[PDB]
């Protein structure tokens, strides 16, 4: 029923390991639909070989920019921006994976892993889905970034999919 | 247009004959009215850019509508290669080179390798692109042979008002300029353009009636 | 329309461009017939909303028509969320989708969604609920278009039995009533509207007489 | 033609007696417009050069056109003898020997023979390059069909711009001249053959003139 | 209204005079016009609904007005009620009970009552919620004081274009349908209706042109 | 607007309704003159946006100024979204995120944000950029209103210098040009527009004398 995607992550090409994600689409729909969709490439354009592009070690690693893969760009599966479904799900630890925005009903497609508890962005940032594999992959990412967010080394998602 | 199997894969077919006459000949009888983007978008189900183009050339008469429709896929295409920049160089062997707007379009680029867009893992959908391009260029068209325009719009003393509203709402569906402004055209201007007797008879039901009741008052 | 493919297991397949080629004629030559309803009853068995939205899009004309189907069915869809509202009570240990009003008129809900809603066990009959509003739309409109009403059918001086008889049964059955109102107004309203010359012919048969007694009676 | 099997080896096919009668059919109803050659090109996909001599063949009348066709598959053969030398003497199994022109034309060769340099590795696409050629004949033909001249074209003084640009794209689509050429003539004599009114209504127009802001200015 | 302290909290202050002058002095000398909402909103910010039932109160004159504004807040608190409906049950020690639909409008509720709601934990903006409604009110006054719709506009031969422009977008300001059919009407309803001299000096410079080259054209 | 209190945090303060009267009052008599802008930038020292919006939403009449003040307004919004890109993304708990092109003018940010931008270290500059966006919506108002050029200005036969001057100067002030062209403007028009007799009374000072002398020579 929820659906069940992964990333298979690079840090310059060498390979780290599998990140996967129970999408809660029977919560946060038409915003897991669109996770799901970018994973698979099959509208055409997606997630494989963009990076994360901005990593606080201790608060989350923000990937998703595909189009100017710098926090700028990205575009949804509904065109380039779309209303906050709902604020069902809070931000209630690590793992959690919920919606960039620049502000309300401005989500495209940069997403966020949570890499710590943060419920100051409950309300503002809707909560899709959470780490199902993977943790401590997520964790060793965060070594590869700085207070600032700026990473040391290119962390890419090599490949992603779908697997349930 | 691709068609699957009885296991659910899918493969080229050739396009049917009697696809291509029903298009040109609703195409010859119906003219450019409305009603030709709902039969498009029935016809070419999961048609790729060549067989597309195939019913786009194939369309003998009404050459300045065809060149509208090329000009509006030609920018379409041209938006997509500045919003999608093509990479260079070597390509992976488990994937295949993204295609650029022109050949989106079908224009430069063999069926077999539209073939292997639509059924690669994961599928790359060309064939939607483009028919999303031609159903907008089939809008602006639609929206070109518009004979009047909504304002002018105004009810003969003898025109019955079953006419009337025929001819408004068939103007309405080929302006197409956007819903709510349609919604607030449909309470105002239906009401205020009236033969004044069947005019007050409307009035008489206030701004609350419906479609309905406001026919059967003029009825009859 | 969805259709058991072999063996057993649904999948989608597309609407065939000859059913809408046969639509669009029976709508182009029979205009708003009663018989249509069951015409498009039985060309859209088992249709998806998507394939619907198409016959009803591909419709050339009538567009007044059109816009009180569309209305009707918004209607329909308002009741059925006012009817089918979530109201509070324990989760269930399984979840299937919910078709909204919007859902269902296949306005806001994708293809996938439709086939997942239907395919699903237990299955949601959103294909017949929408049917159901089209042909409430369908009613509605093809008791408009009756020319004349039921209480003004009369036969001619010289009018054969046969034609006054079709005419009345044919506004009979685009009119709108109970069942026992029509059973009440083919016993009140047929034998004293006829012509004087055969209405004593069929006063001299009963009052309770069938129809084929009277019609053989006049006949000739 | 030839049908891909679905995961499987491409198998031949015979011509569908549907698509040759839509063939015949389109050529005597039409003659030979503009349209007829994307017609072709899209009926004969994929086909051998004995379906494309079958499908000139079964064309009755216009016997002219028919030899003016030949004569022109004649010369693009000896041009391709010419500038192709051909190989002779004993050819190792497994490949098949130099295609001539005239078999490529298909006047000395045989399906068996098609189908191999058809199906060789690298392929060597017989069918499309004859393909070619009688679209060059039936591009001579549409042209020798021209009524009237491109630089000929006047607009009456009550006939509207509407079919005046009408008639100038339909000749401009039949006109022989190269496409660079193409764009400049379309970018000037289409203003400057108007009528006076439209034409000093496109003159205020001025530069960068798109045919949908001429059409929406010579309105009325 | 409440006013914040050097410690940061907030208490209840009594209503200034030369505010409730001001108010009185601006609805009398302008009467109603377009610019009595934003002086309202900034004259009253953060005042407790007993003040804006006072500044209501005070209006002498137009009493129609003041009528209407009570009707339309009468229909708002209405709806307030029916929204949301009160749980039952045991309520949590750290919060206690809300206010009704007619509480909100402050007509049946003590000074302090309105305080301990505005400065609760967390605050609840009676003021503000029946602010919007006032204002909601004041936006159907200002409507009803147009003294012509948006469709009769036709400038005179002699009135100047700067007039012109002023009464359309004073009677826009005061339609207030809606938004978009603004940005509609302003390209349409602007270009339509100009004198034809100066008419035909705008369309030399195309739909693309704006407001500022709009009028210079026209001037001088 | 937020003002510096006792001591040292600023807190935000209301504005002040005196102050809206003043506006309107200025607005009411000095109408749109040079000496608005500098009236406006002092009567909204430091002012949140949504003070000025609430200034400018208080103007009674003159709604072609205002709409002409809000599309510049939008221009230079989207000039300052295409030099001032705004990265999306989660905010950091510390500082506030970059305002974007429409936070800037007050539609899209709330009071708090405005005031968290304001007061925060280092502050962002958005009340000084909307001031700026207003201030050359004004000038472009003001440089509009002016009735006659600067070339026109030319003084009567028995009209004083001290009219003349006086208009010439403003109308030279109301005019939009750089310092530099003005500085060649005045000693070319100046004294060449002026009375014969005061002509050769100015020329007898000299092309370089200032203003002055030039009027304490034809004084009387």
């Known amino acids: ?164 | 247009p691709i068609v699957q199997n009885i296991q659910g894969q899918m493969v080229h077919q050739a396009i049917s004959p009697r696809t291509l006459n029903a298009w040109v000949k609703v195409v010859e009888e119906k003219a450019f009215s409305p009603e030709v983007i709902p039969m498009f978008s029935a016809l070419s189900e999961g048609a790729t850019p060549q067989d597309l183009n195939t019913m786009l050339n194939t369309v003998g008469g009404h050459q300045a509508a065809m060149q509208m429709l090329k000009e509006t896929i030609n920018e379409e295409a041209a938006e997509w290669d500045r919003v999608h920049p093509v990479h260079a160089g070597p390509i992976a062997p488990g994937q295949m080179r993204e295609p650029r707007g022109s050949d989106i379009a079908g224009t430069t680029s063999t069926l077999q390798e539209q073939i292997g867009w639509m059924t690669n893992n994961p599928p790359i959908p060309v064939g939607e692109i483009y028919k999303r391009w031609i159903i907008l260029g089939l809008n602006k068209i639609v929206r070109m042979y518009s004979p009047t325009s909504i304002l002018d719009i105004r009810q003969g003393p003898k025109e019955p008002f079953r006419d009337y509203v025929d001819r408004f709402y068939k103007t309405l569906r080929a302006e197409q300029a956007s819903q709510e402004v349609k919604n607030w055209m449909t309470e105002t201007l239906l009401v205020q353009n009236a033969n004044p007797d069947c005019k007050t008879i409307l009035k008489a039901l206030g701004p609350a009636a419906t479609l309905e009741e406001m026919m059967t008052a003029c009825q009859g």
Request: aromatic share 10%; hydrophobic share 35%; charged share 25%.
């Open chain 1, 1 to 164: 029923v929820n659906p069940t995607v992964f990333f298979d992550i690079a840090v310059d090409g060498e390979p780290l390991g599998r990140v996967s994600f129970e999408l809660f689409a029977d919560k946060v729909p038409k915003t897991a639909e669109n996770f799901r969709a970018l994973s698979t490439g099959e509208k055409g354009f997606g997630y494989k070989g963009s990076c994360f592009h901005r990593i606080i070690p201790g608060f989350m690693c923000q990937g998703g920019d595909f189009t100017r893969h710098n926090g700028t760009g990205g575009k949804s599966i509904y065109g380039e921006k779309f209303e906050d479904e709902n604020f069902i799900l809070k931000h209630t630890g690590p793992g959690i994976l919920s919606m960039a925005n620049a502000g309300p009903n401005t989500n495209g497609s940069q997403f966020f892993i949570c890499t710590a508890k943060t419920e100051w962005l409950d309300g503002k940032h809707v909560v899709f889905g959470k780490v199902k594999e993977g943790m401590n992959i997520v964790e060793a990412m965060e070594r590869f970034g700085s207070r600032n967010g700026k990473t040391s080394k290119k962390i890419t998602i090599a490949d992603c999919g779908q697997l349930e």
